[model samples]
Target: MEMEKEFEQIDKSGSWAAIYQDIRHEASDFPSRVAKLPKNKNRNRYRDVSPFDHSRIKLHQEDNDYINASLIKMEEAQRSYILTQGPLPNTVGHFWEMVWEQKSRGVVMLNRVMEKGSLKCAQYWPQKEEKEMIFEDTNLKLTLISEDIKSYYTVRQLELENLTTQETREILHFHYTTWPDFGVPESPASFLNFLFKVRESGSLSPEHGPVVVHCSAGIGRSGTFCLADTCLLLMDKRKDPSSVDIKKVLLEMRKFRMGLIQTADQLRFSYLAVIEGAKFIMG
Candidate 1:
């Protein structure tokens, strides 16, 4: 009740924009560790997508040692996620290397291959027609085992093999195909369903490593997904959905990955998803 009331007040007073600005200001103070590494600077697909020095993922073997990825851990929820920018043509191998090193079981992709006629992301994984694609750089091969295409999303079963070690792992690819590059989803119901689907697979469980979540810049939609999922998990653990402070939760998440919940609209949609998810959990 208190949290919801606070959110409503912030929404009505148009304080969301204020809070958003505050977050951006605070995030600006964060040192660009990845950016400082001269060799790794060009590796980042965009200037705005650089990882913060405090939480950036480091690649031990790679000469560049940077991949524009952040490992965000929500300790309270016992959940950890690797938030990263969409794979670039050159960084695709590095993306899989992080996944293999982190031992992540799933990849939650929240953007389409192309948005508004522009290539928003690279085709990192294998397509049905191709069946398999090999990354010569990392000596990693990804095969499309199966794909379940739904109204708003596609669930793909992928097999990732490390050619050097001859070891392979099954990776779940949960792609939200309908989400716009810079817009909110149509409704919270569909979004929550997708969240629950990922959860039911035990991909987000502590037993597994953090799930790698990426969307273009990896902050806007990715942040919303992490925030809503974390909020719902907290609500479930507490037995009182109203007790969780949605704003505070988001702030805590931002500490791990900067610029989470990018726009006011993204933050607003997060609240809606949390409210809807709470009702579902309560029932």
Candidate 2:
């Protein structure tokens, strides 16, 4: 019990500033050699938030073999996820290309196309009115087949087709719409509800490719959601509550993508989400 209680004490210690310090990076960082190049510059939404070189995903199928996405993996769960910045207008085709090339089964988008004032994310997917949309770079067609809207999230069934080859696949788009400006969910209960909705779809299962998750920068919100899912899933299998190390997990996740779980409050929210979501597994 002492082992379990130590982390519980850690969580309640100093508002998670301790955990936040354990994970954040310094300004004097190693080079993201790929994300810094002249040709790849336009693909990154923000210069400061580029993916690290080793773990970053490459899309040779596209005109440019670079994209601002990283493959995050968990050794504990043997699960893989891609955390990425929201698509830039120029990178929209590349975004779809990454999805298709990665063989992703689903996309968990955390932010809207336009939030607060500026258009932070590109309108990458087909709108309900558009019915279907085509991309020039990737030569892929996206059709909005069906939409299921809930109080806090929307589930869209989209048909992805290779324009030339004529192969088609279904992609589940899980859009979470209610994350507040504070960069955290209203409650862990509601966030878990949305997460479980995605989980129920079987889109996150191992048979499929890595699920792509993104927010504006693809760091804070995306990281929190994935962290909760990892810990909760680990608990479901191992039943050793103390075996789940949230800090170690996030640190390992950050090894693939830079700046995951951006703030202390976000870290706190992840703990809250995992703690609440874990109860569901135990029950």
Candidate 3:
């Protein structure tokens, strides 16, 4: 009797034809242009790259380890995940080898993406570099965003000197990102110096644009930088820094993305990096 009940409850070998078609309808007018990505493509890049079999964790099973790991349950979850739209599901379906966000930690896009032709998104990614900067056009005006911890102030300023307005639209154009987090807190200070150069210029960016930031999977380095900015704001409000919750913010990240830390040590290091960062700035 129990076996029969289990069999009835099991939705093995179900169909995703309807769901897949829906995604096609919404994402592109030329639906045939899309390709289904193989499960194992560039799995090595992700620290906690869940095998295709056990990819998505159900909303309820998110807290349960064992149930989330079962092959039957996981396969079902994976199918559901791909059917959805937005960053993960869309990026996964198209076989994007690496959806890199070159920031201190999290997914960062350097500038507001410019859409060309029929494609709804921009293909280029903006980052930093140490060598001589070059772009296709002149009159390249940009802004720099940062915060002062001790003084309790946020700075959004301009950059001058070398900038090419025309070539700046190219996503493949690589700018060497100055600071790479080596599991340290003091890194953002260095990053700030780099951004300051851009701010000193009189040119201002459109207020609606998004700033770029990324580190590996964009959880640790990217997350820490944003958290620092957040903490600075709270400090400005005269709130208790010690009481501010980091994990709470991190938990929110996993809602749309997974394996944020990618490892056990990475998780522990997340808080340690912040603690060290506070010391670096204050003490």
Candidate 4:
């Protein structure tokens, strides 16, 4: 746990890069046999990225249960975030089905559908008032009901319906639209504002399913948001905020999802984001 004193020391010593390198090198080698099997090859967005089996979400659909996602549980923070990649074309229905089956209150999307004119994530959700997605593959239809346009992010409300059962549920989509030039957000304070909005929504509570968090690859910006949110919340719950270890909490989080905080810059940014975010939470 780096108190302000140790955080200052680490900052002046230029050890964030070294600490990031150490984390990458020490990443555990867990078996993801489910993702590597021939049947689930196309289900993966990145060739090398796959969810570890132990913490992965196994769809109730049985044999067709591969989703490029992981359940990252934090006992200290009392949080469970489902970290994942953006939906692939064929997997869009699977994605919605997972959300429905999982009963998630919201989806935290940290990347755009396209970036730098290249397709980053598939246009997973309908932008306008489409009748319904009619995803017969998963028997779930996603319909956009309303949208709140924010400068940096867009909040859309949707209804997920079971075509067969004729039952439906409202789902919240929190899309972060600020990453274009650099992979990270240009302003940490701005992102923290977005994070706090998600916090105030009551969607991250345990009464609901785990909040689904994703980026293009699911490990970069999503990790930062999750890391920062969890650390700050843990700090808020503690009598002494400095007793919590930022890097140690991140290490425990890494055990749930591989390659979290992808780059050294992102790893360092996670710390800054947490530091800035903690200020608002502190009295």
The model with the greatest lDDT is 4
Query: Which parts of model 4 have CA positions greater than 4 angstroms off?
Result: 1-3
Q: Write the per-residue lDDT of candidate 3 for residues 1-283, one digit (tens) a residue.
A: 2222222342253323342233223321211111123432332234332322233222221222111111111121111111111122223312211211111011232212222222322332212232222222222322232222222122331222223222222121112243322433233444443333323431112221123333334344444444334333333344455654545544433443333343333444344444445554453
Cα lDDT tens digits, model 1, 97-163, are: 8899888999999998889888878899888747679999889999999999999889999999999
Cα lDDT tens digits, model 4, 77-124, are 889999999998889988988898888999999887877788877888
Clashing pairs in 1: none
Find the 10 residues in a row with the least total lDDT in model 1.
25-34
Single out the weakest 10-residue window by summed lDDT for candidate 3: 65-74
TM-score of each: 0.93, 0.92, 0.34, 0.95
Residue 217 of model 2: what lDDT?
94
Q: Distance from true position, residue 67, model 2, in Å?
A: 0.4
Error of 3 at 103 (Å): 16
The candidate with the higher lDDT, 1 or 3, is 1
**lDDT score for candidate 4 against the true structure:** 0.85
List, in order, the clash count of every candidate structure.
Answer: 0, 0, 23, 1
Q: Alpha-carbon error at 62 in model 2, in Å?
A: 7.1
